[PDB]
Amino acid sequence: SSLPQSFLLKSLEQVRKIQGDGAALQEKLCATYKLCHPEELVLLGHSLGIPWAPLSSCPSQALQLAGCLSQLHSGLFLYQGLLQALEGISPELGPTLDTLQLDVADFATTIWQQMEELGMAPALQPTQGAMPAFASAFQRRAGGVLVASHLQSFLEVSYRVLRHLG
C-alpha cells in the first residue's frame, strides 16, 4: 500500500518465480541424491557455519520504507553468494542452479532500484568476502539442501513483507 504498483506487482511475481525455481532444486536434490530433509543436516550445517539472513518487522513509513527493503536486498546478496559458492553442485543440477541465480539477481535489481527511489544511504566501497567451504560432492549437495530451504523461508517472509509494504 505504500509502493507503486509497477514495483509491487513485479516484485511479487519475481518472488514466486524464485520459489518455483527453488522447489525444482529441492525436488531434484531429493530425487537424485536422497537428500530430502534439511532437518537431517543439522550437524553438517553446524560444520558449515553459515549465517542465515534475518528479516524483521518494519513499519510502512516514509523514513524507513527504504530500510525495510534494504534488509531484503542484503539477504538476497547473502543468498546469491551462497548459490555462487555451490558452483552448480553437480552437472545434473547446474542448469537449475543457474536459473535460480538469474531469477534471484533479477529480483535483487528490482529491489535495489526501488531503494534508490525511496532514498537510501549510499553503499560503501565494496570488499571481497568469505564463502562457505564444501569439502566434498556430498557436502555441496547437502549444502544445496540447506541453502535452498533457508532461501525458501526468506522468500516466504519477503513475500509477506512486500504485500505489507504494498
- From CA 76, how far away is CA 79, in angstroms rounded? 5
Question: Does residue 104 contact residue 80 with C-beta atoms inside 8 Å?
Answer: yes
- From CA 30, how far away is CA 14, in angstroms rounded? 25
What single letter denotes the amino acid at residue 40? E
Count of residues making up the chain: 166
Measured in degrees and rounded to the nearest 5, phi and psi for residue 12 equal -65, -45
Taking the CB of residue 55, how many other CB atoms lie within 10 A of it?
A: 17
Measured in degrees and rounded to the nearest 5, phi and psi for residue 105 equal -60, -40
The cell for 101 is 541465480
Domains of the chain by residue range: 1-166
Question: Does residue 69 contact residue 90 with C-beta atoms inside 8 Å?
Answer: no
The cell for 139 is 557436502
- Specify the experimental method: X-ray
Question: Does residue 25 contact residue 93 with C-beta atoms inside 8 Å?
Answer: yes
DSSP 3-state of 120: coil
Taking the domain 1-166, which CATH number applies?
A: 1.20.1250.10
Whole-Å CA distances, 89 to 5, 44, 138:
37, 16, 9
Q: 90-99 as b/e, with b when 16 or more CB fall inside 10 Å?
A: beebeebbeb
